[model samples]
Target: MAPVKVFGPAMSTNVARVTLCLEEVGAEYEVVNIDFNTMEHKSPEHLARNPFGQIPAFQDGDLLLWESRAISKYVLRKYKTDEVDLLRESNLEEAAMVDVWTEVDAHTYNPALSPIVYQCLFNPMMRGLPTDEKVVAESLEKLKKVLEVYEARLSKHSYLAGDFVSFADLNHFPYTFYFMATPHAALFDSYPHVKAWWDRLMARPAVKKIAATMVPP
Candidate 1:
């Protein structure tokens, strides 16, 4: 079979989320970078692949897919290795927690984090667009609140969905990596458990390997 195909630049935060899951599952895959400046993602061909014209459209055989989280879940469901259970499939409670934290990351965390990342990282560096300091400050307030909850949860569990790392934990890594590259990374230090958790996440070989593409210009 041909390798899975991922469409978007390696440096794209959302794109990396999909690719990281592929890497974690040891899936054979290839990446085709998209040029946002050229509006390639909005081109007719890409819109056929992603209705939302988002980054990280994917294909496995004839299956076309979008949404980084959805792609991650599909990859995990199909290629799960005996060495690890990222979905917590055998343990229903843990699987429930995975769902819980998945919602948390999607609804709670990204909402707070995305504005800051959009203003501080993508605006200034990625696209040379001007940033809004007021926007970033407002967003950071929400992020601190979310991180407090994260600190409390992480203080007890090694990963978000309990002891073992799950899709939820990995889901946080993509944008969190961008947040760290921002001037406000020191926020992680205020919460030691969250800090340690980030350090631990960063220590993963797959994380390190994928994160290598995340360095800011």
Candidate 2:
């Protein structure tokens, strides 16, 4: 196998997701930190890797790719064996279920969660700004609706897609880690199944390792 290189800030959740997948697959790789303060992601060289100037740009052999989830799916598809067949290839319907929840993570859950996490956790930690209660409230309202669906789903299934952990469940680790660590931790307590699912995900070795890097102190 050729070398894998991940270019991004170590603390970025997007980057963490790729690294988490890599670790889960037990792939040897390197992480090249891109200095966002210096605008390295916008540089000519970096822009060639990701046209959007995003933090995470993966280089695996000749393929250069961005987007955290896509990179994860690629890694799992390429490297996973019967021992770690997260995609559930034996059942196409199960695979489609994974895809559906993965889309939910991207399109619905993340949008609702990311901004609140920024306002409540990142802004306060990095900028020394106080958490914006109004924004937090609004984001929480959005997150609650999404979690209600999650609560229902998790109540029936151990993982988001099914009984097995997939990229869909793993992708939530980064954002949800910060969310539960912040003052809004009580929000999770309100949803037993969501909380249980979160706890199980966090307990996984790969997720635990990646999540440790995501917290600032």
Candidate 3:
């Protein structure tokens, strides 16, 4: 397969999401930066790459893709096998589990946690605004409910989908790593299984390397 190109800077959790997958599946890829500060992502060229005007659109040869999860799944399927199946595509039951938990991460988990991240880090540093304590407080409570589910799942299994890691778990790394930089990071202390799951994800060399670039502003 030809090397893929990912368009966006490293800081966006969505951009980081794609990069982490590229690293995990050992893909030959290049990151081409798009300047959000200058609104390049909204430029005509980028809109062709991502119709929704989102950051980190993907290009693989003549084939183009967008939406971080779609791009991530393609990379994992093309690169890794059951020997290290990040998508767990080979097994019927496990694949379903992977999809279920992947959905959980995108819908159930990220929604609750991202507001806190944005309020704490992005508002202050990138947007030049004060943190919205109200939004953070609300998101934190929702995050707690999501973590309760994670703790239960992880309490029984090593990773979100199962004992083995999948794209499901990989997807969480970008945003959660950012969350770890916030003052509310100690919130992880209340969920030992979730904390342990995070530790396992961080222990991966690929994860650690990408996470290094995900520092909060």
Candidate 4:
């Protein structure tokens, strides 16, 4: 069994999703850090590995793959052969539910999450500028609207699809984690069901391990 390596900016929330998934799957792997500070991901070596020059690239045995979501699914498919609950094998309805929830996270959730994160964290951290209150307000309103829907749904079901947590749970890992990490942490407490769901996910051993690896900026 050759060692698997994930190449990326370890601190990136997007990369953290795959990191959490890998940890959850109990797969052993190395993370090769790409110094985005030095623009190393743009170099020829990284370009050869991922023509898009993306931070998160997976090198596993003979396969070299890019894209964080693809890397996460690939890890689960390859090493998590025994217990593949993230993706259903025999149940079409369950699988479709998983797909729908994951899509919802990607489309509705990620978009709303990004602006808040940018205004609260990235702009202040990198640009050394005051937080954009306007962006934060708009993004928060958008997030609250989506979160209300999540609160409604989660109140009925224990997890996104039902009682069993799935990949959709894993998919929300990074976005929610970032919000919890920010000074606007109070934003999370605004939604009761969503906050409870976040707490449940945060308590997972895999998520704990992934959170430990982060280098705070």
Best lDDT among the predictions, by candidate number:
1
Tens digits of per-residue lDDT, candidate 2, 27-85, equal 88889999878999999989988999997999987788998888888888888888887
Reference-based TM-score of each model: 0.94, 0.93, 0.95, 0.93
* Residue-level lDDT tens digits of model 3 in 1-217: 6679999988789989999998987888988989878999899999999988887799988888899989888888888865778877778999998999888888889899989889997787776999878998899899898888888989899997887888889888888888888899999999999999999899999998798877644
List model 4 lDDT by residue over 100-187, tens digit each.
Answer: 8889989999888887777777777775778778877888789889988999988988789777778888998886777766777787
Clashes of 4: 0
Give a tens-digit lDDT track for model 1, residues 128-155. Answer: 9999999998989999998899999998
Tell me how many clashing residue pairs each candidate has: 0, 0, 0, 0
Query: What stretches of model 1 exceed 4 Å from their correct place?
Result: none
Worst 10 residues of 3 by lDDT: 208-217
Q: Which ten residues in a row have the lowest lDDT in candidate 1?
A: 81-90
Which segments of model 3 are wrong by more than 4 Å? none
- What local distance difference test score does each model get? 0.88, 0.86, 0.87, 0.82
lDDT of 4 at 157: 85
Order by lDDT, highest first = 1, 3, 2, 4
